[PDB]
Design a protein around this motif. Structure first.
Motif, mmCIF file in Angstrom:
data_model
loop_
_atom_site.group_PDB
_atom_site.id
_atom_site.type_symbol
_atom_site.label_atom_id
_atom_site.label_comp_id
_atom_site.label_asym_id
_atom_site.label_seq_id
_atom_site.Cartn_x
_atom_site.Cartn_y
_atom_site.Cartn_z
ATOM 1 N N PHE O 3 0.918 -1.163 -0.145
ATOM 2 C CA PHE O 3 -0.024 0.126 0.064
ATOM 3 C C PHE O 3 0.926 1.154 -0.150
ATOM 4 O O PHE O 3 1.787 1.460 0.657
ATOM 5 C CB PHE O 3 -1.086 0.130 1.201
ATOM 6 C CG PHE O 3 -2.303 -0.588 0.645
ATOM 7 C CD1 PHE O 3 -2.806 -1.706 0.249
ATOM 8 C CD2 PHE O 3 -3.343 0.509 0.630
ATOM 9 C CE1 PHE O 3 -3.944 -2.250 -0.084
ATOM 10 C CE2 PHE O 3 -4.885 0.116 0.231
ATOM 11 C CZ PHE O 3 -4.867 -1.368 0.049
ATOM 12 N N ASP O 26 4.849 6.521 11.723
ATOM 13 C CA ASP O 26 4.822 5.227 11.914
ATOM 14 C C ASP O 26 3.335 4.727 12.131
ATOM 15 O O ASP O 26 3.113 3.390 11.704
ATOM 16 C CB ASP O 26 5.715 4.802 13.305
ATOM 17 C CG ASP O 26 7.070 5.379 13.060
ATOM 18 O OD1 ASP O 26 7.749 5.415 11.922
ATOM 19 O OD2 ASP O 26 7.777 5.545 14.092
ATOM 20 N N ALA O 27 2.357 5.574 12.602
ATOM 21 C CA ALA O 27 0.997 4.918 12.451
ATOM 22 C C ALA O 27 0.421 4.993 11.104
ATOM 23 O O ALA O 27 -0.427 3.980 10.762
ATOM 24 C CB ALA O 27 0.107 5.943 13.581
ATOM 25 N N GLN O 29 2.548 4.287 8.207
ATOM 26 C CA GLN O 29 3.120 3.031 7.917
ATOM 27 C C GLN O 29 2.530 1.657 8.340
ATOM 28 O O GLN O 29 2.439 0.835 7.627
ATOM 29 C CB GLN O 29 4.568 3.037 8.506
ATOM 30 C CG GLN O 29 5.476 3.997 7.851
ATOM 31 C CD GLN O 29 6.036 3.708 6.370
ATOM 32 O OE1 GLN O 29 5.500 2.798 5.989
ATOM 33 N NE2 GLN O 29 7.131 4.187 6.241
ATOM 34 N N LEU O 30 2.056 1.878 9.827
ATOM 35 C CA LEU O 30 1.126 0.784 10.314
ATOM 36 C C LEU O 30 -0.256 0.737 9.323
ATOM 37 O O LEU O 30 -0.746 -0.472 9.321
ATOM 38 C CB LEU O 30 0.555 1.146 11.798
ATOM 39 C CG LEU O 30 1.376 0.723 12.946
ATOM 40 C CD1 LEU O 30 0.723 1.226 14.143
ATOM 41 C CD2 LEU O 30 1.102 -0.810 13.347
ATOM 42 N N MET O 31 -0.840 1.638 8.991
ATOM 43 C CA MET O 31 -2.037 1.796 8.181
ATOM 44 C C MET O 31 -2.172 0.975 6.664
ATOM 45 O O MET O 31 -2.854 0.519 6.316
ATOM 46 C CB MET O 31 -2.675 3.198 7.831
ATOM 47 C CG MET O 31 -3.632 3.256 9.349
ATOM 48 S SD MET O 31 -4.330 1.982 9.772
ATOM 49 C CE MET O 31 -5.756 1.770 8.615
ATOM 50 N N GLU O 33 0.211 -1.535 6.304
ATOM 51 C CA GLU O 33 0.136 -2.667 6.804
ATOM 52 C C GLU O 33 -1.353 -3.238 6.956
ATOM 53 O O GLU O 33 -1.632 -4.407 6.390
ATOM 54 C CB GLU O 33 0.864 -3.030 7.951
ATOM 55 C CG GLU O 33 2.611 -2.603 8.072
ATOM 56 C CD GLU O 33 3.403 -3.762 7.527
ATOM 57 O OE1 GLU O 33 4.580 -3.512 7.516
ATOM 58 O OE2 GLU O 33 3.015 -4.842 7.056
ATOM 59 N N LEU O 34 -2.196 -2.642 7.743
ATOM 60 C CA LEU O 34 -3.584 -2.912 8.036
ATOM 61 C C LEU O 34 -4.446 -3.222 6.838
ATOM 62 O O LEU O 34 -5.161 -3.939 6.652
ATOM 63 C CB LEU O 34 -3.965 -2.004 9.274
ATOM 64 C CG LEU O 34 -5.464 -1.985 9.907
ATOM 65 C CD1 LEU O 34 -5.925 -3.512 10.086
ATOM 66 C CD2 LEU O 34 -5.606 -1.221 10.948
ATOM 67 N N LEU O 35 -4.294 -2.105 5.962
ATOM 68 C CA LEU O 35 -4.907 -2.102 4.753
ATOM 69 C C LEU O 35 -4.464 -3.454 3.683
ATOM 70 O O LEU O 35 -5.278 -3.856 3.225
ATOM 71 C CB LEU O 35 -4.852 -0.841 4.111
ATOM 72 C CG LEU O 35 -5.873 0.276 4.543
ATOM 73 C CD1 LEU O 35 -5.465 1.508 3.687
ATOM 74 C CD2 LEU O 35 -7.212 -0.078 4.658
ATOM 75 N N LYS O 36 -3.314 -3.288 3.792
ATOM 76 C CA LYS O 36 -2.494 -4.475 3.202
ATOM 77 C C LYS O 36 -3.202 -5.733 3.483
ATOM 78 O O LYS O 36 -3.809 -6.648 2.725
ATOM 79 C CB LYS O 36 -0.945 -4.247 3.321
ATOM 80 C CG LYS O 36 -0.170 -5.905 2.940
ATOM 81 C CD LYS O 36 0.975 -5.986 3.953
ATOM 82 C CE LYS O 36 1.302 -7.335 4.098
ATOM 83 N NZ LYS O 36 2.298 -7.739 3.026
#
Lengths: 93, 74, 105, 74, 105, 74, 74, 105, 93, 74, 105, 74, 93, 74, 74, 93, 74, 93, 74, 93
Positions: O3, O26-27, O29-31, O33-36
DNA sequence: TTTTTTTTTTTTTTTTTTTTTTTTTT
DNA sequence: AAAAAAAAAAAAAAAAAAAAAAAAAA
DNA sequence: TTTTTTTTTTTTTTTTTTTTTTTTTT
DNA sequence: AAAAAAAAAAAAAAAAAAAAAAAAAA
């Protein structure tokens, strides 16, 4: 004479019925035979009438009915049946 | 063909020993029938006789042989 | 049959009374004449029975008397004349009954 | 001399159409007379014939020549 | 028994009348039919007689006369009309009894 | 065709429980009429029943059908 | 089990010549009993006749065979 | 008509009677039988009513009572004894009629 | 218990009658069918005793007769025509 | 062939509330007939259900299919 | 025909009152379980009816009352008691009949 | 909440062998109640069975499992 | 089991609701439709349960109030509108 | 017409991780509403899909077309 | 693989209703991942249902059968 | 629309990943499926955004951190374990 | 349900190339058959198309994807 | 006008055979299927008549007979089977 | 490029009901052309369909969407 | 089998034309595709040959020539055009 | 003891009332 | 679906008829 | 003139006697 | 072949009951 004149009309009618018989057997009758029938017819009626007289006279009566007549030809039985039958035909009146 | 109502009447009235006798119409109409049976059975017996003794025609001889029989019936 | 029996009875008396006439006339009869008169009276009796019936029937009764009978021999008048004579002798045989049973005093 | 009373009775009980039909003493008595003259004249007529054609005994030929007229009187 | 002999005397007259009706309608009866109408008449006279008894007892008499009987066939109208009329012809036999009985003058 | 005085007399004296019961002259001549009419009506109604079902002779089953009706009439 | 009182009474009042005629309470009860015995008699008699001439069916013919005496009885 | 209504009500009663009898004999009653006894009974009632009238007026009364009824039931003896037996219980039931009205002292 | 014995005695002759059927059709049963019909017969006899009691109590004598009895086989009419037949025979005893 | 008669008696007596109830000899005999018909119907009906599903013996499944109609019949 | 239309209106109320039970349990009915109860209802009426006829002919009345019915409710004990309760309640519905019919005192 | 009055009436009059059978008001009323509890119990028992065998709806199989006891109680 | 009997009760409710909507248009629901919605709504209540607990815990209460409900159902705007209306009728009861 | 509190209460106690958690009566009433609107919208949406594609009834095919949207909305 | 940062950021700031909100790197960068992982398990579960009823590919029906499952997890 | 070509860039990023799925198991998706996931996440972004804001407001902040995000991935725990790891990979920068 | 023979004749006579053409009795009956098979098959196949794409009746889309091949066989 | 009625007369008959078909498959016809099946019969009657003509005039006859019509069902095996069956049946009539 | 002469010839003689049927060499060369274009147009429109509805390779749904139209043209 | 044997030999040549179409548009075929046209050709040759038999016999002959073959490709217009050219080219042979 | 008339009481029949059952209507 | 009328049976009171007690005679 | 009883006188029905017809026996 | 009984019907005389004339009271 009166009686002679009626014997001629008798011969006529005797002649009538003899002819129906002539076509029935397809054969021939002598005229003297026709003549002998009217003689006995007339001879016979004498006895029939005078017999009927005694019968009717015997009946407490003066004039002829059906019973006196049916008394008179009791003798041959083909005749008895024949005439009772014919009497129901004439009884229509 | 055959017996008049009047014929039989006249014929009877001719030989009445009492003249009080008249004939009822139906009794008159029965005698045409009786005179009918009478003459033709005399005629039938003349023929039966012509036929019996082996013949060409119906003559006096044969009839007078059946005369006994007719008297017996009437 | 019963009637063969009664028929031959007729013949017997015919044989006898016809002998009365054979005697009277100086002429003898054939057996068939004899036999004939017997069977003839027998035929005659049918006509006698029948006629007498219609006479007694005709008078509203069942016990037949002289008048029905005098009427049966009506035909030849020599006979009805003969019959009356002989019926009057019957009236004289009738008088015999009144002598038989006797009356009051 | 002649017919026997009961004989004639049963002979007439032979040809009755109603057997309830009676014959009285006198009537029967005269029946005999009838038949008396009946055969009287049967015999008498037969011999007048045998004589009239001049016979030496009475045979059936003459008898049978006297039958017709006897029937007509009765 | 005495009863069945009376049954047979009744059978006679009914046989007579069955043949008279056979003459009028030009059609005759079976012999068994004759037997059945006689059985009928005998057992009918039971109700007739014992009905007649209580009538003579109902009218307080011992001896039965015309009035009880006229009332015994009270049931059908053709029959009732018929009986009363013939009561006048029977009374004509009493008029003959008028010819019989002594009247003084 | 007339019914008998004596016949009806002895017939009636069958079912009397009291013998003192007499039948007067006219009461006797009238029961002659009642029985006559009864028999003529029993016979006439038998023929009318045989006529109804077109029988060619008058038999048992026809009278049995008018048995109900005859009992009530007399 | 017998006829109902209303029924019996109206059927009787059907035939009084004088309608002033009543039926008493006890007479009504007698007739309840009487019509029961009458009908029981008819059915009983009929059954015996059918079985006497050996039928699976009590027919009208058998009832008619017991009619003569039934009606003499009532 | 009104008589035909009552003839129909009569069929009901005969039906009940024959129902009970049918279960007694263990053989059913035919359609014709029930109908014929219904009509039998109505026919019978004509002769009952007229004789009852003859008896009432003979015994000088306008209301037919028990005596005239028993007079009518005279004919078979098993029937006559039946009647008198049951009459006692109904007469006993009349003792109940007297009893339903209250008594003075 | 004494009633459980009757269930089992119902079973004992229920064991025998279903075998006539086994001879007849060529279909025999599990012994589980035999047990369930015996249970049924006993359970059912409870209602029939109660039922017969209701009828006999309603006819107001204390012994049950043939009437009440033939009335308890009422429901199927094949049963009922059959039932009346056999009563005729036992009454000839 | 069939049920013990004393069995039937005693089974019934258990279930009377007032044991003043008795069962007649003839009613007992009818009861043995009834028990026969009861049990045999259970059995023959179980058989016709098994037949229908082409079962190899009568299983409890088929029995319980025949309980409904048996209950209706009793 | 005649019977099946009554059965169909029966099917209707069954659907409804089975819904009342479905109501009570939050558990669902096959429409077919519904159909089973309806037919069964019909054939049960047959037996209820047959039995109530035998009651009524044998008590000599032609209109059934509550007592025959409660004899018909004999089988489970919860049934018998429950029915009796409800019989006195609707008897009060016809007591209403008496309150509303005008009573003059 | 239950059955229509004239509905239940018509149902039962469909099976009466004597048509003279008629139904009083209180009888009719308790019949509405009986048919109610009757059918409700069929439903109740069906639900017990579905629950008991843990079916996700009330099916034919369970229904049949519940029928026997219904009819034992009626 | 818990879920299963309670799902059968929920399936009944869902069956009722579908019948309500079927009545409206006379357009009816398949067996499978009803079932799928019943299970979906059962699993929907797992989202409700966890979320309600997190938001109660999240506002330092254990006992869930009207605000939590309305918080959870904030989602479709016509609904928050109409559910606020019914909370007035509730605030009356 | 709609969801019971008791039902919702038991179902949701089944999925709580904290059981100390109890639910206010007010919250409970508002969620009676939310649950009902959720389910009825699923049904209504099912119906609209069936109509839109001209089905004769609302099938699982249509439901599946309505599932995705319902859940994004919830 | 997955993403884009600026994509994820823009999308979320469209639906926030306070704009004072800033998101740390970083939050986000987390999103990424979460959407991925969202789309991954959306696809993985789409894949597992197609396999399961044995589909010719991963097509809409299967996914919508597991759309329940996906939106419960999200 | 802002939304529209940005739904086009969403449509894009997701199209990348769906092809990489078409590699692994060696089979692809339908056109409407690609579209359906792009739409679905867009609708899902509604769910993300609301809830995230209400978490940041719980913690007295507007500036969004690590905690709200990983608490958004609270739902399946296979996910929660996978993502805490990658959060260490990111915590490095 | 069988093609009107008057209909088939006038239909045939409208677009004959030589007007000398008539149709014999049996031939037109067979054209009635051939036209009857034509309609029946056109119909069978139309139904077969709507359910294949699972439509909830047979719309133009279905039948018309079958009308291409209908003209090749006829 | 005259050909508009022949299309519509073809419409009624085609509609009977097509409602025969609604029974058997458990699936019905839209107006459009019915209307599109009728247009074809009318339009198909063209090339049947002109092919029958080309056959009848091509055999030096003025009237079409049984052989031209059986020849018109030529390129399928099953039409042969069924129609010869029907040709032997109508030869009975 | 493609079809061999023998392929086609043997292929033809398979379905002949009369094998007196011969094939000229030019007509054989021509059937090579026909079936060559047969496969090419079967492929082309199968291919053209996959690309027209945007599929991710040439898949059977697309060929068979061109099958009614192709068997019309052949 | 001989049928199967011919099927695999036809499969060869149909896979040829399909591969050559893989060359031109840089577009690859699913292999189900290659089999569906090999099977299609085989049973299409029933359609082609049964009709070719019918044609040859209708024109006074048993041996199928150029005429019947050219008549069998008369359906789409690009087919008719295609065929006539190649006929003059191979008529030179 | 015998003979006649009026008032009250009771009995049976007929009509009407009152209730129950079945069909049609809105 | 719900309520009243129509039909049928039963019951209650009024009409019809007799019997008891009180009045008048031979 | 009015009331009741006994003797003689006559009338109508039933049984028996006496006569007549038919049938059988010696 | 002749006579008498058997069977039936008629008629005769006694039985049954009323009405007239003479005897005693009201």
């Amino acid at each position: 004479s009166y009686q002679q004149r009626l014997k001629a009309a008798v011969h006529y009618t005797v002649g009538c019925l003899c002819e129906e018989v002539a076509l029935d057997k397809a054969m021939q009758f002598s005229k003297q035979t026709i003549a002998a029938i009217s003689e006995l017819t007339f001879r016979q009626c004498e006895n029939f009438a005078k017999d009927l007289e005694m019968f009717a006279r015997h009946a407490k009566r003066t004039t002829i009915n059906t019973e006196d007549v049916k008394l008179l030809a009791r003798r041959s039985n083909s005749l008895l049946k024949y005439i009772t039958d014919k009497s129901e035909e004439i009884a229509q009146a | 063909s055959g017996f008049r109502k009047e014929l039989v009447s006249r014929l009877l009235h001719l030989h009445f020993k009492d003249d009080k006798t008249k004939v009822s119409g139906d009794a008159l109409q029965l005698m045409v029938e009786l005179l009918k049976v009478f003459v033709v059975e005399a005629a039938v017996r003349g023929v039966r006789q012509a036929q019996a003794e082996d013949a060409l025609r119906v003559d006096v001889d044969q009839l007078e042989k059946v005369l006994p029989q007719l008297l017996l019936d009437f």
